[PDB]
Write a protein that holds these residues in place. Structure first.
Motif, PDB file in Angstrom:
ATOM      1  N   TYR A   1       4.319 -25.717  96.062  1.00 50.90           N
ATOM      2  CA  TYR A   1       5.703 -25.784  95.561  1.00 50.90           C
ATOM      3  C   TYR A   1       5.719 -25.669  94.040  1.00 50.90           C
ATOM      4  CZ  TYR A   1       6.441 -27.809 100.199  1.00 50.90           C
ATOM      5  OH  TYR A   1       6.421 -28.003 101.527  1.00 50.90           O
ATOM      6  N   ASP A   2       6.856 -25.279  93.508  1.00 49.99           N
ATOM      7  CA  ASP A   2       7.102 -25.338  92.060  1.00 49.99           C
ATOM      8  C   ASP A   2       7.716 -26.686  91.703  1.00 49.99           C
ATOM      9  OD1 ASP A   2       9.876 -25.171  92.471  1.00 49.99           O
ATOM     10  OD2 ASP A   2      10.011 -23.149  91.526  1.00 49.99           O
ATOM     11  N   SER A   3       8.025 -26.893  90.441  1.00 49.22           N
ATOM     12  CA  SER A   3       8.561 -28.192  89.946  1.00 49.22           C
ATOM     13  C   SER A   3       9.960 -28.492  90.525  1.00 49.22           C
ATOM     14  CB  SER A   3       8.581 -28.228  88.443  1.00 49.22           C
ATOM     15  OG  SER A   3       9.380 -27.186  87.928  1.00 49.22           O
ATOM     16  N   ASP A   4      10.680 -27.468  91.006  1.00 51.07           N
ATOM     17  CA  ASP A   4      12.031 -27.583  91.623  1.00 51.07           C
ATOM     18  C   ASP A   4      11.879 -27.937  93.106  1.00 51.07           C
ATOM     19  OD1 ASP A   4      13.323 -26.459  89.294  1.00 51.07           O
ATOM     20  OD2 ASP A   4      13.142 -24.374  90.122  1.00 51.07           O
ATOM     21  N   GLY A   5      10.652 -27.956  93.636  1.00 48.23           N
ATOM     22  CA  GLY A   5      10.416 -28.145  95.079  1.00 48.23           C
ATOM     23  C   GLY A   5      10.559 -26.872  95.890  1.00 48.23           C
ATOM     24  N   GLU A   6      10.651 -25.721  95.241  1.00 48.63           N
ATOM     25  CA  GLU A   6      10.759 -24.412  95.951  1.00 48.63           C
ATOM     26  C   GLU A   6       9.358 -24.008  96.388  1.00 48.63           C
ATOM     27  OE1 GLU A   6      12.911 -22.179  92.987  1.00 48.63           O
ATOM     28  OE2 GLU A   6      14.752 -22.241  94.200  1.00 48.63           O
ATOM     29  N   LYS A   7       9.249 -23.459  97.590  1.00 50.93           N
ATOM     30  CA  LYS A   7       7.987 -22.950  98.165  1.00 50.93           C
ATOM     31  C   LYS A   7       7.560 -21.694  97.399  1.00 50.93           C
ATOM     32  CE  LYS A   7       9.847 -24.370 102.637  1.00 50.93           C
ATOM     33  NZ  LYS A   7      10.463 -23.661 103.788  1.00 50.93           N
TER      34      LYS A   7
END
Ligand SMILES: [Ca+2]
Length: 273
Positions: A14-20
């Motif tokens: 994931y990225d820092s935004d919680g996006e896969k």
């Protein structure tokens, strides 16, 4: 711990935004990134070029003095990536900066503390044709002692696929070599599926796509790769940060493995690419 292993069959990054961003396979080893904040719920990690976050639920801490951690090592001729304790792939020529038999560690297989690798096949635009002819591709079976391959004498079909779909035939041969053990896997023989393409075509379940014969397998897989990868902006093999490896495979070294086979074939056929 500095190193963690993936416990479930696959786990997301994931990225820092919680996006896969991507997904990686069971047993993969990720590096703790000490330049970003971790908490008890998510670790800042790096794997195969990708810097992101993983759920601690998906990870087990390793001890590098007793657990296998992937590394690179030169034999004085080629530089090898140990992707598993008992499996290495050649990724580059030896550089004078490399101490023979010394283990080296790298999150992308490009940047090392004392030297920098070119892995040109890993980033090569796969819409550029190979300089090898059908007959040259067909020679590689004898030169690499490849026996009982369904892909034997299919150089002309690989070159047709390249002419029609504008996808590099050396890449197509290397990808099929890696995914199907040179067209010797059960999926290769049962279903003429040399590229690990799965679909919901014949069963209510995810299964290997079926192709009618070896030629339709080669041409149909190339069409599928063109439509699903090349045409959607995935135009090189890459790693977990960019290229086909982001989506094509959970294996973080899928791209490196195919590039390695391209490197080996290119060397045996006289270095035209
Ligand atoms: Ca984002």
């Amino acid at each position: 711990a500095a190193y963690y292993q993936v416990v479930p069959v696959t786990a997301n990054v994931y990225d820092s935004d919680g996006e896969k961003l991507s997904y990686i396979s069971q047993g993969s080893v990720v590096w703790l990134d000490k330049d970003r904040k971790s908490d008890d719920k998510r670790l800042a990690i790096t794997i195969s070029g990708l810097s992101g976050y993983m759920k601690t639920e998906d990870l087990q801490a390793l001890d590098a003095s007793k657990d296998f951690i992937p590394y690179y090592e030169s034999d004085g001729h080629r530089f090898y990536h140990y992707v598993a304790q008992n499996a290495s792939i050649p990724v580059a020529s030896h550089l004078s900066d490399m101490e023979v038999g010394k283990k080296y560690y790298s999150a992308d297989g490009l940047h090392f503390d004392g030297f920098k690798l070119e892995n040109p096949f890993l980033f090569k635009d796969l819409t550029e044709a190979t300089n090898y002819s059908a007959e040259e591709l067909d020679k590689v079976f004898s030169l690499l002692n490849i026996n009982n391959s369904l892909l034997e004498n299919k150089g002309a079909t690989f070159k047709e696929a390249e002419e029609h779909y504008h996808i590099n035939a050396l890449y197509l041969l290397a990808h099929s070599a890696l995914e199907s053990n040179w067209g010797r896997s059960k999926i290769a023989k049962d279903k003429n599926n040399f590229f690990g393409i799965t679909a919901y075509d014949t069963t209510p379940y995810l299964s290997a796509k079926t192709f009618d014969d070896v030629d339709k397998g080669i041409l149909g897989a190339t069409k599928w790769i063109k439509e699903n990868y090349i045409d959607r902006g995935r135009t090189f093999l890459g790693n977990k940060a960019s290229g086909m490896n982001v989506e094509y495979a959970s294996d973080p070294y899928w791209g490196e493995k195919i590039a390695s086979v391209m490197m080996k074939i290119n060397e045996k056929l006289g270095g035209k690419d």
